[PDB]
Point group: D2
Chain length 115, copies 4
């Protein structure tokens, strides 16, 4: 699994469950859809892509924080958290993008490994 | 100011100086405002009360150029940052492989 | 000031007002300075250039009392925060189950 | 496993490997040693304690960031990151403490589950 996403909720002290994650890749010209999914009961999203699909490029991972907070009855500030990075440029790597969410703040970090 | 940006470096423990910041507003992204961080890591003067209407905004901080100037290989292209406005300070704390961003209303 | 503390609330998007802050210095923890956050979430006036010598300091922010006043059940007792000093701003961003803290030197 | 700790490195984009973690419990009078260990190659520390040992109380988890950064040739600011919470007060829970480290900043969050 070359691209994994893990999301935690700083208001509830829990995994962020059933949060939508969309991945786009930058096109020749615009953001083209690449892969999407929803976080699990552990806050994790595995199975986005495959080694064969995951080419070099500039990717955007957008986590739908607005829907997540609204469904919980919380007022979100950010529409979404938008993590943008160059992948695979010096060869294939495995990436984990972790995100910690609050209504008016988020943080995100990357773990990169060389398989 | 209706909108202020502050950028801090978590590796060196210093303000992030001369970092480019662009703000965009969602149209029916229209560039909306931009500048470069001061010696204090702050950017004031972006907009006015008149122009800053309710809507969806994106603040994008060119973190990649900042790290490269320092000789450090960064992960991200930029710390974007996207919110609905319904006085705002947007703060960003930068590391090579992480960032956090927060909004404060005064 | 040699030492400033700022506290922000990540749930409400506001400065954290009237939060108690205690600073301690490691002895051969001696209370060193303390106060309460202003309407801006800031605490100035903690110490002087004379008293603030190199050493190991702990800044402890009473986050539990802040959340309880708001009617929110918090995880932490306090966001402590412990560093070696060799002008410092200590910033803390608070959520019920998380905090982050950063130091900036000017 | 009622108490787990996971640590990531924001400078390197990696797990924080072989970082010392000490847990103390507040005593009747002072911090009494409770449990300690080192993070794994995945940045995780399992096996700190057992359900039988983990009683209600005020715990301090101290992560030795100073040694970790010094061994990597980086200048640390914080001596250590000191996470302090009441545990088990309304009954036993499982706790994960996650920490993201940089030289001049750290964040930490809790995931609490009711087994
Ligand atoms: Ca290439
Ligand atoms: Ca309106
Ligand atoms: Ca000295
Ligand atoms: Ca009890």
């Amino acid at each position: 699994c070359p691209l994994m996403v893990k999301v935690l909720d700083a208001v509830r002290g829990s995994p962020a469950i059933n949060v939508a994650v969309h991945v786009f890749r930058k096109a020749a010209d615009t953001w083209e859809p690449f892969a999407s999914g929803k976080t699990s009961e552990s806050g994790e999203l595995h199975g986005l892509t495959t080694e064969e699909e995951f080419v070099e490029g500039i990717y955007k991972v957008e986590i739908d924080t607005k829907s997540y907070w609204k469904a919980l009855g919380i007022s979100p500030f950010h529409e979404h958290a938008e993590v943008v990075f160059t992948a695979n440029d010096s060869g294939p790597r495995r990436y984990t993008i972790a995100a910690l969410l609050s209504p008016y703040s988020y943080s995100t970090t990357a773990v990169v490994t060389n398989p």
